Design a protein around this ligand. Sequence first.
Ligand code: CLA
Ligand code: CLA
Ligand code: CLA
Ligand code: CLA
Ligand SMILES: CCCCCCCCCCCCCCCCCC(=O)OC[C@H](CO)OC(=O)CCCCCCCCCCCCCCCCC
Ligand SMILES: CC1=C(/C=C/C(C)=C/C=CC(/C)=C/C=C/C=C(C)/C=C/C=C(C)/C=C/C2=C(C)CCCC2(C)C)C(C)(C)CCC1
Ligand SMILES: CC1=C(/C=C/C(C)=C\C=CC(/C)=C/C=C/C=C(C)/C=C/C=C(C)/C=C/C2=C(C)CCCC2(C)C)C(C)(C)CCC1
Ligand code: OEX
Ligand SMILES: [Cl-]
Ligand SMILES: [Cl-]
Lengths: 76, 449, 44, 61, 36, 35, 243, 336, 32, 37
Amino acid sequence: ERPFSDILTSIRYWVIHSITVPSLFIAGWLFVSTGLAYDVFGSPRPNEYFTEDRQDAPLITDRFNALEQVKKLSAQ
Amino acid sequence: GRDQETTGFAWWAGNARLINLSGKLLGAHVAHAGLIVFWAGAMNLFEVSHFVPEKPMYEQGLILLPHIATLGYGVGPGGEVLDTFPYFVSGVLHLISSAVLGFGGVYHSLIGPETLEESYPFFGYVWKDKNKMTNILGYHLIILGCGAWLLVLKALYFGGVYDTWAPGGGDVRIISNPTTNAAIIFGYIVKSPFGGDGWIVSVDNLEDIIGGHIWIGTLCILGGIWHIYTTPWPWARRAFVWSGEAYLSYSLAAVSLMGFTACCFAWFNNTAYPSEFYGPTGPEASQAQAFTFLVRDQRLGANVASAQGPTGLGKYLMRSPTGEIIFGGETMRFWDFRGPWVEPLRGPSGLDLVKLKNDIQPWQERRAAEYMTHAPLGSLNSVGGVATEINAVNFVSPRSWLATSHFCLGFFFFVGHLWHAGRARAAAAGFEKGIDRVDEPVLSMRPLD
Amino acid sequence: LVDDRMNGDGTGLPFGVNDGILGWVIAGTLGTIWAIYFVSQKDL
Amino acid sequence: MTSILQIALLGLVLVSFALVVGVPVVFASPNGWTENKGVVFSGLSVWFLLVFAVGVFNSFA
Amino acid sequence: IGRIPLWLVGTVVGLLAIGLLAIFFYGSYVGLGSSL
Amino acid sequence: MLTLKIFVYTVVTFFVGLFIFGFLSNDPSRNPGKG
Amino acid sequence: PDLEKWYGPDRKLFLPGGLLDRDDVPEYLNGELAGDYGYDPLGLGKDEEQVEKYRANELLHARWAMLAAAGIIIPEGLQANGADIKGGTWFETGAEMLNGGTLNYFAVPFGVVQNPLPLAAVTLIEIVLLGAVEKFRVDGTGPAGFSPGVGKFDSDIFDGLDKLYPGGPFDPLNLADDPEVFAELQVKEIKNGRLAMIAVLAFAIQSYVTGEGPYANITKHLSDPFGYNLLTVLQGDDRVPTL
Amino acid sequence: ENTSLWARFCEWITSTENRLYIGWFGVIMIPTLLTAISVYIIAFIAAPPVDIDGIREPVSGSLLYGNNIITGAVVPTSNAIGLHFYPIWEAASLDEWLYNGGPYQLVVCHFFLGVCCYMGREWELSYRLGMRPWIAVAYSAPVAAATAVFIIYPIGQGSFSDGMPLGISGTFNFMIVFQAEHNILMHPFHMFGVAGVFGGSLFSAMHGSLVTSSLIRETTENESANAGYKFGQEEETYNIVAAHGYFGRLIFQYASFNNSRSLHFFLAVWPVVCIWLTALGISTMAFNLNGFNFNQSVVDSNGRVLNTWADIINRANLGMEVMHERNAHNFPLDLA
Amino acid sequence: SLTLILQLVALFAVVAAGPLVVVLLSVRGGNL
Amino acid sequence: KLPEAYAPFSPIVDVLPIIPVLFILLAFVWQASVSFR
Ligand code: CLA
Ligand code: CLA
Ligand code: CLA
Ligand code: CLA
Ligand SMILES: CCCCCCCCCCCCCCCCCC(=O)OC[C@H](CO)OC(=O)CCCCCCCCCCCCCCCCC
Ligand SMILES: CC1=C(/C=C/C(C)=C/C=CC(/C)=C/C=C/C=C(C)/C=C/C=C(C)/C=C/C2=C(C)CCCC2(C)C)C(C)(C)CCC1
Ligand SMILES: CC1=C(/C=C/C(C)=C\C=CC(/C)=C/C=C/C=C(C)/C=C/C=C(C)/C=C/C2=C(C)CCCC2(C)C)C(C)(C)CCC1
Ligand code: OEX
Ligand SMILES: [Cl-]
Ligand SMILES: [Cl-]
């Protein structure tokens, strides 16, 4: 029935979770330490928040051309 | 230890399992005392390892070194620190005593005798043996009176204590002629706790402090001898409950009262808690700010008695409800503040105009400016200033920390007193586990409620 | 002084007592309650 | 005179760690306190002697 | 099958959780978001 | 206005005395339980 | 009375019940001597005859060290408080009258009197007195004398008297006829004497360390406890502050 | 034998036969409270304006001076008095006693004594009815909240003017100024308090829905289900096993309360401990411990300030701070 | 840093002392 | 700061505050080890 008292007390369970959980932790570490998080989620790095053309907070100020304008206002 | 079936108490009430076990009770108590002295020593060592000499101790987040420095160890005139070795010695001695106490508590907890009554009749006790409980209370009263007299000897013959009311800005003073007059000592006790009186928080001199300590030490010693050589009277036996949980509830109410009272000392009193070590209080910082801006606008060629505020009440100096000359602005609510740097500027009618004009002191101005900069206003991230302030100052007053923590502990312990007093009354009554289901008291009396 | 006041603020008055009549009525009320309690003893 | 004080203090720390790990072990062991009398007494005596040695060597350093 | 004690597993898991929370609290005083 | 203070002090002392000596009036014997 | 804690198999021991069970107490310490705490970390007790032979020297040391501690602490205290002692310090008392500067004896409450006796005469009469005294002790024979207890006792009173506890002439105030009070006063005497030997050893080592008398030590320690103790006198001179 | 006057009075006081139990805690609870209600009704009806800030600018607060029910409030004491005790006898005239906010102190003191003795009386009736006594322990949380907002915060800030005004708009003013001063929203104790009241509403709805949903069918559909319950019965009125099974397959099986005693203890303990935490949060703010300060925390590599939601909350705090007590500050630092 | 390394080693040795004594008592007989 | 003779022991000094928290958590560990009987 596995009432959580057998799975959490079995070395058969714990030999495969001793690699998968650290592997997931290392994958999460590398995902943000290699810039992939900034790549896929569009979050700016601390050195690219402000550009040379603008030194303030960006404003979307448009709806139907928002894609092109946020591409122009992003940090390239 | 025991289990649920053999005692009826669950693990989250496991200490109740040692209500009737005197040896395990003693082991838990001695191990706890070891824990307390361990925190004292460990915090002393941590604070002296994180102590910076060229900064005041209230900027560095210390609470134990101000306590030791108030007694006059490693400090000189003006509140400056001369040596940290006394603090280090106190910390090491507390750590060693904690090791000894922890060994004793662990030994009694694990392999000590379970019950002391059948083998050690002096240390054996049952909760209904009121004579033996009064004997234990008398022994502890002798210990407390000896500790109070030890503090008295420290302030009299063993280097004195730090007087913040000494001329020039405070110094380590030897107490001479302690005020042992019963009228002035107990007038603090029978005083009102409101503004202008402050109950015992408004004790303003080490003479009254040491006189009250002499009185409480002598009273505690005579009361201990009285309890050792007497028994509770029949009126006390009728009025009180004589269970261990009842005695615990009485102690809980007492220590809750002490926690609230010590919170009030830490927030208001600047005599037993010198401002040079604990930082300015709320009233002290507000009055320091008002006085610093007073002397600034006086240096800038502006009249201070005249030149009223926008409300026409007075920007700098005005009248208290009684009639004394007080600092203007919202600091009127702190018009009862008395500090070492305002008293030489204060005459019979409050703040004297000619004294504030010509009897100024650079050390008073510097202390007032430093207290204005370091008001007890901060966030729990240790961000100095009001809640709007920018994360740039790393300072929260030790007075604020002590007051907040001690009022919290006092309130929890008041609720604990409520819980334990109710459970003690219900346990002595017999319905602490529920209603007998065959002898419901409500069905025994008539309807209509 | 345009009007009359008790002027009892501060000064550390015992139980806020400014006139001996106040302390005497404290003593009298407590004493008569204690006397009623003491006479009505040996009950239940 | 400072290096010997540091050595004595490090030995005191090690003896304290050995005590706080083994004394509950010795006490709560099933019939272990009866035969661990000598080793526990030696550990406590060495701990007290090291405390006194650090204390007396603090005045010389 | 019940080889490792459940209390030991819970103690290890709680120790890792407490240390991880302490790591996050330490990260509030250093690096980004620390006003320094 | 001293008379008002005297009256209030008398009433407060009366009620506080009833409280104190009522709890001295063998309060645990008003137990609806056994013992 | 109350001899059930200083005598018998159940009595006060040098370690409590948890530290020291009664099984590893040495078999020759059955609580029949006064002051038996079962204290034998090293093998010196051997058997009953050996332990009583050593108890003879223990009692002699105890009764000597009690007078020693009192005679060390009293004249130094009197000299410090203002008496004309000139040599109240115990470790330099002998050196005062080396060339004939004889000491002053202070017989309270009416003292201050010179002693016109040179060192050779004092040591000669001391030897010819205490040698006879110790010869009387180890032989149990006395010529004749008068004591407040037994009046004009003859030579046939010391025979049959208990070794190390001779009653009669040495007991003028009695208070030892009852065996129970005699036994509890015996354990009182041996405990006081052990404390006195410890005190005399402390006096000697303290004098060697600090160069002044024990009364000066205790007075300066009560004057400044933290500022004057073993760690203060072992520091040599002051200390660089850690500020 | 119960003939003496004090014995008869004690039996009448401790009598459980009264419509409302009085008790020895009630002998303080009743007169102090009725004093507080009497002066509170009279002040709320016809209280003259009160100079709260001490700057000789009075605030009406009472209905007969032009206030409605939402805006009507007993105004706190004058700031000139501060933490001084101001009874009627300490004032020369009733006019200045009303002008300086004396009714606020009288109501606050009598209300604190009344709630404390109400808690004591709750314990006393629990004792005299053979009940377990921790109903007063549960009631210690609103008492703590009232004490924190009426006495402890005036103590910490040094003036009774700083307490919660006895009203509705005055209460909102207290909350707004309080947010300006301490940033209460960013405090963990206030966060636990909010979670406690939200969870208290959630658990009240949960428990009521589970019990009312699982009532045993003893009536028809044309009569009220309450008519199925007879008072004083010993038979259970709902299916505990069905309710527990529904909750278990709703949220979690092994993380559900199968015991009604543990379930009701949880219902008792959760909002009570959370209100304890938020009352202690207010009391710690009284000594100016304040909430989380995250103003200018996120900074980029060039050191420019990157504003956050906490910075917008800072802007709100600034807007409240520059407007609260608009004439009572002669100096910049708000240390009072 | 050396200070950080010593702090971490001391912290780990202390925080492991509790689990060490409990595991040693659980596997060495009982009475806990 | 600490005395110069006791300067290297500062890292073991800094850990010492958290020991009571570790003690109450150790009580919880022991109660887990006795299976919360
Ligand atoms: C020195 C004071 C003191 C003493 C000696 C006792 C002693 C006792 N209490 Mg008690 N209690 C106290 C104060 C005290 N209490 C306080 C202040 C409260 C709060 C109102 C309580 C509430 C309380 C309750 C509800 C119960 C007891 C119970 C008991 C008995 C069993 C305890 C046990 O094994 O539980 C085990 C201990 C724990 C499980 C620890 C609890 C976890 C705590 C809450 C974590 C908090 C730590 C946190 C970091 C602190 C920060 C908070 C704040 C200070 C900022 C025991 C004899 C029980 C009883 O009645 O037995 C008959 C029980 O039901 N107590
Ligand atoms: C102030 C903290 C404190 C203290 C001093 C105690 C003390 C005690 N508890 Mg207790 N307990 C506590 C908190 C505390 N408890 C809390 C918070 C809970 C709720 C989880 C409980 C729940 C609880 C239960 C259910 C029971 C006790 C019991 C006991 C008693 C015997 C335990 C025993 O011998 O079993 C053995 C324990 C062990 C073998 C664990 C070993 C751990 C060792 C001793 C740690 C020592 C480390 C230290 C560094 C050593 C230094 C010594 C020296 C070198 C300096 C004992 C006197 C029992 C009792 O009531 O007695 C009948 C029992 O049934 N407690
Ligand atoms: C709350 C204090 C307290 C109390 C009431 C007791 C009571 C008892 N202990 Mg105990 N003990 C304590 C603390 C206490 N202990 C501490 C702190 C330690 C660590 C050293 C010990 C270690 C200990 C052991 C190892 C044993 C006992 C034993 C006993 C039992 C009988 C024998 C005896 O008295 O030993 C006498 C204890 C001593 C001679 C130690 C010296 C104490 C002197 C008198 C100090 C003077 C007190 C003075 C005011 C300084 C106090 C410091 C203060 C500021 C904290 C007895 C019921 C024995 C037992 O369990 O029976 C089987 C036993 O073997 N205790
Ligand atoms: C914290 C230490 C302590 C503790 C726990 C106790 C505990 C106890 N004492 Mg005791 N006592 C102490 C210290 C202590 N005493 C000292 C230091 C002295 C010397 C002055 C005395 C002298 C003393 C005497 C002469 C008697 C007791 C008695 C008693 C017992 C009953 C008291 C009672 O009915 O409750 C509390 C009492 C009351 C509520 C009524 C007294 C009215 C108040 C409290 C007295 C002070 C009035 C004053 C105006 C209050 C100002 C302070 C206030 C505003 C906060 C009780 C177990 C009685 C007893 O049973 O004999 C064994 C008894 O006759 N004590
Ligand atoms: C501001 C002014 C007031 C200041 C008062 C401060 C001094 C008193 C404060 C400490 C008193 C200690 C109380 C312990 C006994 C209380 C319970 C009791 O009573 O114990 C009850 C017990 C029962 O056996 O009796 C007994 O032990 C006898 C104990 C009581 C003995 C004292 C009685 C004093 C006499 C006063 C009566 C005047 C009576 C008539 C007044 C009428 C006025 C018109
Ligand atoms: C050191 C010091 C000092 C001194 C102090 C003192 C001296 C104190 C005290 C005091 C006192 C001397 C007090 C008393 C008390 C008492 C109490 C607090 C109590 C109680 C309790 C209760 C509450 C009760 C109740 C009851 C009733 C009423 C009824 C019946 C039942 C019973 C009994 C339960 C001074 C400030 C000067 C200075 C600084 C420091
Ligand atoms: C029984 C019991 C228990 C326990 C309890 C307790 C409370 C214990 C304890 C204990 C204790 C209370 C301990 C203490 C200790 C201490 C120590 C162990 C110490 C030491 C020492 C040293 C070694 C030091 C050193 C140093 C110095 C000298 C200075 C500088 C720095 C240093 C650090 C280096 C529990 C709860 C778990 C469970 C239940 C039961
Ligand atoms: O009075 Mn009510 O609010 Ca407490 O902070 Mn300062 O003072 Mn006023 O300002 Mn902000
Ligand atoms: Cl202002
Ligand atoms: Cl406003």
